[PDB]
Design a protein around this nucleic acid. Sequence first.
RNA 1: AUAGGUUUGGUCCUAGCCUUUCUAUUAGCUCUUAGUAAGAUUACACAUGCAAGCAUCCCCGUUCCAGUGAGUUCACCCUCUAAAUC
Lengths: 52, 77, 50, 232, 190, 115, 109, 291, 164
Amino acid sequence: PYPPLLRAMIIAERQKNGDTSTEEPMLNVQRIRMEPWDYPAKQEDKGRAKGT
Amino acid sequence: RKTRHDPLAKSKIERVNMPPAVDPAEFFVLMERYQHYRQTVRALRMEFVSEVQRKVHEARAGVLAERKALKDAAEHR
Amino acid sequence: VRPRLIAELARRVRALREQLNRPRDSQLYAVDYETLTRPFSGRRLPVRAW
Amino acid sequence: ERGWSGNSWGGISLGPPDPGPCGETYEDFDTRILEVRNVFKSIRVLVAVGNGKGAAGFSIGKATDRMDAFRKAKNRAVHHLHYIERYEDHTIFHDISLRFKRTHIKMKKQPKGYGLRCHRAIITICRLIGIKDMYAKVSGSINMLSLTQGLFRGLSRQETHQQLADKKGLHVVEIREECGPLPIVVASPRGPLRKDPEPEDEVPDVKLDWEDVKTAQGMKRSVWSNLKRAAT
Amino acid sequence: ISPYKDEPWKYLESEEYQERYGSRPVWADYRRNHKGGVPPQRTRKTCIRRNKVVGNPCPICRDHKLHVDFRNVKLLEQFVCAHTGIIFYAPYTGVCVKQHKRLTQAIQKARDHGLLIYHIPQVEPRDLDFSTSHGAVSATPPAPTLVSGDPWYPWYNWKQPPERELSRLRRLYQGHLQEESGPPPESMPK
Amino acid sequence: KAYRGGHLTIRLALGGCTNRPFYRIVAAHNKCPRDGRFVEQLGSYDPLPNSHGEKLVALNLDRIRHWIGCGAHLSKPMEKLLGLAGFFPLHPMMITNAERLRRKRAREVLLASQK
Amino acid sequence: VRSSVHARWIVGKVIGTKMQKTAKVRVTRLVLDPYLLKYFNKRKTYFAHDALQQCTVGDIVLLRALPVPRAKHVKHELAEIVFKVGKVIDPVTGKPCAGTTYLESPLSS
Amino acid sequence: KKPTFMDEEVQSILTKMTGLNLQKTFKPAIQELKPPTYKLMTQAQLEEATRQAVEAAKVRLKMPPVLEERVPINDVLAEDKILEGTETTKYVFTDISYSIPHRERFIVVREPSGTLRKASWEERDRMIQVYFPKEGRKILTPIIFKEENLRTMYSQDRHVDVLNLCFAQFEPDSTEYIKVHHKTYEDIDKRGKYDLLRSTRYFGGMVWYFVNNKKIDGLLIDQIQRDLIDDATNLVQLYHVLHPDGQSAQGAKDQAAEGINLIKVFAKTEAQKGAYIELTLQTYQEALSRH
Amino acid sequence: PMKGRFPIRRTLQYLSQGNVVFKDSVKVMTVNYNTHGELGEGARKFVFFNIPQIQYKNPWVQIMMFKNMTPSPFLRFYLDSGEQVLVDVETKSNKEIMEHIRKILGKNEETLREEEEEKKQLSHPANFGPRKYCLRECICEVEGQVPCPSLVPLPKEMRGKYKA
RNA sequence: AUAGGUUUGGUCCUAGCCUUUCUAUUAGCUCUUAGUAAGAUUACACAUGCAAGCAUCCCCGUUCCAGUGAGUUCACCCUCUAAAUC
Ligand code: FES
Ligand SMILES: [K+]
Ligand SMILES: [K+]
Ligand SMILES: [Mg+2]
Ligand SMILES: [Mg+2]
Ligand SMILES: [Mg+2]
Ligand SMILES: [Mg+2]
Ligand SMILES: [Mg+2]
Ligand SMILES: [Zn+2]
């Protein structure tokens, strides 16, 4: 579901533009894959300690 | 604040930051809550990014913008 | 603008000396197991790793 | 009551003028001292009189004694009265710019409640005449006699709205911001009315004062302008 | 001690006031004492200092029967321009700062009580359209969770972790554990 | 001004007086001072209850959505405010702190009963 | 977007032709005096690429910005000659003129 | 259907009944003054200026719409019980996006119980004043609208000032607006002060209220006494169209009453003081004959 | 007094009376006019009275004047596209020339009103900040809210000195 | 500036200087309370203590914030286009 206020605003805009459909607004989350925090990162992009 | 060239204070050269103790049940529930909340917030952020890009595209080459461009070009003619 | 050439000279010399005096992994990631500190920098490892 | 200063004769009232040999009384007239000077000894006094209803005058008096000079000046002033036209009996009909000898005077008509923001002598003379709202600036040599003469001259040579209507044969219509777009006709020609409109001068060739334009544009910065002062 | 303290406006229609001031304002005859031709841009703070009047008290302070009250409308009118409705600044009438502040407050109170006439302009409406059909002011369709009594998201509620995960955490954090917490109270304890 | 790296973030800049805080919700570079230069003011937050017993929060939702869609980050207090407004989900820590406070009040009630 | 030169179109008078394929042009703009509130002419010199060497000192020319500068000071090119010096063609009628008098009468055509 | 207040026919009747007195419409305002300007004008130019002033007055006298009292807002967006007891004061969230009509603007309240609900009309008005302040409006209700201060204002015959303050402070569909306007109209009716509102934008609303509450007797009497017979006949006609199934409309249809006969029809059928209406009308007819 | 004939021309109010705001296409305006001849009189007036106003309203447009180079006065406008617009101005008064150029190359009132409405959005009334940019400095200026401690002391319970 | 004082035996003109107004610092004398704001003269020299960590090791941060006004048209707009966030 959308957050309450954002859902209310989406529905209000829909009714303002004449749409009267009753389907609930929904946030698609299938494309947001939650990667485990301990997944290996990109070592090529990591830095190195400077000599001193 | 100190710069990297400033020396470390002598009163904390023997300081160990001991990690805090964990409550396993609360820890696990909080981890799951952060996962779900971040998924939802990322979905919302993607939606807002799409709105911003769509508004920019409409401003440049939308039907209203192109109509107004043809209109004032004609009027000039 | 009066040229600032010493700055360029120093930048180039520093880059060369950093690329020629690179610390090696055996130096950077060595550890003293008694005190659990890096001898290269003297910084102690986090407790949760000890 | 004191005059313009504690030790100054200027601004002090001398009371009503004495009943004249013609037999007229002047109980409605007030007299004010404008200047007292030692003539090398005699005394020369410049005084002004006025009934507060447009009739006002001024005179010089020379005598060995101060009181004799006052009496002479007052009695001669009452017999040399100007009548000063007042718009709505509180202000002048239009802005008046004049130069008498080396003394320059700019006078500006003002709305009700503006008060007398004028040279102190001008404030005194205006109170004698009956003008209640006006702005005045005196430039050049501040000579008291020249100031008085120029003030009376300019105020006596002001054109009333009726005079302008008769001259131009047209309605004089007043526009007030507090009254909106309502046209108020203040004067109409006594004779016939011209059917051709005044030329709509796209840019009039008027002589502007840099002082007024500078104030209007906000480039005036004087620390002495628009200071709070007692009611006048 | 004034007999007009309870009804100050009485003093303005008493013969004593008429003899003292006539039809002119109570501040008409007052004059400040100062050096130079340009007066200081503020009046004195107060003419009465520790129950002692200064040598030249201001028009309000020089008369103890003049009471600055929001009901004394006629006295307040003397300190407002009749042609612009603007309260005179203190140097105009010579009133001290204390009495000027009191007069300003009394005038504002009189205007707020409808006792002193002031110009009330005619304004345009706030909105162009007066419709109330938008969802911001109308009823929004309830969400399924609101009808069902469930939380908006399932993770708003506490779910007991499996014992295997609790044991995994107990191994991960050996020697640095707190007492395990159970499900929280369903409502806020009173 | 060029900062090394950095990003835009929507955060709370503190104004007001001693013992009277007030907040402006602004989008600013993270490296900038707290009350310094900002890109846009996106709202305000008065944390002191007014005469009606209300904490007033103004949110420019259109501009907040714009700046989130342009890559701006959010500070934790701002995320919590947006969760309270219903614009975002309730932050996990509001839920966790509520549960902790419930448990603490339960312990206090149990102490009272035991006494 | 089409050019990095600030002045896209400018009109000026050719004041020099001593450089090869380059004309030195004087451009006047009207600048307000903040105090007097009167407009005064302010002059600026521009170098314009003139490939064909058709510019003569004193003629009024139009300069178009180059997409990028071709030299340190050459940022413009000669778009056209508005008024050739002493060979002015009246634009309203199209006929040659010498000052305020027609060399060829408009009625002749 | 029954005509609305904004119907063209009703609006024309009320506009002509209001009148247009330029002197009252553009009465000199007590404000900061500037030196007046002067123009030399011919007769034609003066007439053109007067016509432009008439058009400006017509714009100034535009009648505010008459609205029905707004229904209270009672809508819950969410019930987050987990938040219950975690806060002591409510949060008010106002969406301050610039380009939104104020009646389409989302304003919500998070209560200490954890309920996210929509703000009430009073809360909406206070918040909109807080963030979009309107000149003349106050966040806190002025005390002039209390009953005692309203009595004082009425005693000073400052009804138009009261209505201007009401229009500045309250929304047209708000309860306070309606109550104050109705109280002012009742005072005008009780004390016969109708002329106070003539040539103003509130006369139409007052007339509409009187017509819908069936108390046009005093206004009709005042119009007759002021020799505004066309206004009186139009008032009876508006009464008939607003009440077409009443005794007055039926009688006027029956005997084919027109003009003053409509007033006689109303006085005989549906007037609370028809006798005195008849007396005033008969006196007016005698005066007209004598003149 | 102010020097020169028609000193009103050198006042900001007159300079802001100008009603010609060129479209963005116009880059250069050349004004060819003649010093003598009745038929060019209006053009001369156009140079005397209206060029200052046009320049004031269009500071980035290059205006240049030419004298006695052609038998007839005329205006020429160079556009960014490369087009040239010629306007003959014999027998035309200065007011007529102004109206003509306003019609053919001037922004209409609708576009100007749109631009002012866009300018309005930049100054949001709800923002709090310095007087140079915002209506109010702080929320404490809003009635019903807690006022400044500078003007009204806070109760001891809300001050840290009495909480620590 | 609403101006005023002052050149002469005297009048007029010109012209400088000063007075009256509003701030800031310092000095003399004097000084009850509460709230708030602001607070080295010095780019002279500095005793002493603090001002940068975090984190299952890698990294990241310490290039920020805070300070000063010595030097002084690198600050603004347009074109182009890196690094950075998404
Ligand atoms: S300025 Fe807001 S509390 Fe003082
Ligand atoms: K780290
Ligand atoms: K410096
Ligand atoms: Mg003395
Ligand atoms: Mg001098
Ligand atoms: Mg001291
Ligand atoms: Mg600091
Ligand atoms: Mg990049
Ligand atoms: Zn006093």
